[PDB]
Amino acid sequence: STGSATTTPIDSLDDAYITPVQIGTPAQTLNLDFDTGSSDLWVFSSETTASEVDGQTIYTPSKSTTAKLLSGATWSISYGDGSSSSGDVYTDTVSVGGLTVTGQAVESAKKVSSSFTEDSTIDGLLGLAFSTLNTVSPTQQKTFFDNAKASLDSPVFTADLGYHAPGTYNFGFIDTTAYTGSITYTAVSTKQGFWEWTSTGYAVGSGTFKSTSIDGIADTGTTLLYLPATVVSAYWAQVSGAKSSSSVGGYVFPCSATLPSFTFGVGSARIVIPGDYIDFGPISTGSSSCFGGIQSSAGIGINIFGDVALKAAFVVFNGATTPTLGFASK
Incomplete structure (x- = not known):
């Protein structure tokens, strides 16, 4: 079925x-x-x-x-x-x-x-x-x-x-018509009950790719992308006027900005999140401060590939005896 x-x-x-x-x-x-x-x-x-x-x-x-x-x-x-x-x-x-x-x-x-x-x-x-x-x-x-x-x-x-x-x-x-190119599969740990996997790194905008292991979960029920503070700081440093606001609860940026893309690694493959996906709009109605879609995971205790990341891909949740995750561009 x-x-x-x-x-x-x-x-x-x-x-x-x-x-x-x-x-x-x-x-x-x-x-x-x-x-x-x-x-x-x-x-x-x-x-x-x-x-x-x-x-x-x-x-x-x-x-x-x-x-x-x-x-x-x-x-x-x-x-x-x-x-x-x-x-x-x-x-x-x-x-x-x-x-x-x-x-x-x-x-x-x-x-x-x-x-x-x-x-x-x-x-x-x-x-x-x-x-x-x-x-x-x-x-x-x-x-x-x-x-x-x-x-x-x-x-x-x-x-x-x-x-x-x-x-x-x-x-x-x-559905082989729903994605472009090939699907890259990557290992899953079920030890914490999640679809937990390790990204191979990231890039900000047109910048060079940083090879680094980022353990996190594929979580359709979380809106944003939560990553280590180092990664998140490197992203927002490329947006003029962006800052972390303790009063708002995360990174904010001027609504007049054009956001850079964010790339994450899946094995040797790369998924590109367009900058527009990272815009969550005014912090309050009429404000010119906008809320960022990439936020620090520090104090969550886990990195979360939420909807911001997942919507940039076609994602396979493979529940075979040894589960894996697949990502393709689309």
């Missing part, structure tokens, strides 16, 4: 991407944030504290003939941005782009933090990291991908995120 679904930016900055997901019988379609940095499929629901719902579409398990309470199971998750959610668990039928999993754990939120409430466009998350990170207790549950894997034509999914445009998540096949 295979599946193919379009993923759409939630706003004009590509802050996140939503993908429609069918849950239950008859189908209830919710728009979920596919997150290769976590491993829980959770949704706003009929159980979510009413004051914490503001515009989201909810899953109502009592209206699904295939829903079953997973008795005694609870979940609770905290994300890198400080947001969180928790609740109980149902199993139900879940379909993405024509690919169906029966008996998928659907984690129903009883509580969500303010960031989730305030984002009316995101109805929940669909985790695509390794199932070892799943938070369901006392019986850990599998991701949608893990459950689907055996049925797929090939044990892979691909992320093809757009810049200010829709893109695609495919399951079970590699």
Whole structure:
């Protein structure tokens, strides 16, 4: 089997991407944030504290003939941005782009933090990291991908995120029309539960490539590119007037600037992030200070190849017995 679904930016900055997901019988379609940095499929629901719902579409398990309470199971998750959610668990039928999993754990939120409430466009998350990170207790549950894997034509999914445009998540096949050149594959460590890999270096604009190992994670659920302070300083030094602002929470730059590109290495291959991808617009409405899309990972504890980086590539998440990651230009 295979599946193919379009993923759409939630706003004009590509802050996140939503993908429609069918849950239950008859189908209830919710728009979920596919997150290769976590491993829980959770949704706003009929159980979510009413004051914490503001515009989201909810899953109502009592209206699904295939829903079953997973008795005694609870979940609770905290994300890198400080947001969180928790609740109980149902199993139900879940379909993405024509690919169906029966008996998928659907984690129903009883509580969500303010960031989730305030984002009316995101109805929940669909985790695509390794199932070892799943938070369901006392019986850990599998991701949608893990459950689907055996049925797929090939044990892979691909992320093809757009810049200010829709893109695609495919399951079970590699669309050879969706990228240019060849795909370069690189090793993955699953030791921390992430799609963790080592970039071979970077360049700023038309500058020379610096060969240096940068361990980090491919994380579709993180907006920006978070890299070591040395790398980030070298980038922003090429933008007149750019500075790190503790009050704003990162590097800012004059909105009048033209940003240089940023290149990262995948083995001997190179992925180029155009400068425009690194512009996250005014820090507040009407400001002439703009927020940067490359930020320091210092104090996160891990480097993160988030959407800024991933959207410059066609990315293969290869879930074979020994997982790997592939990157192609597009």
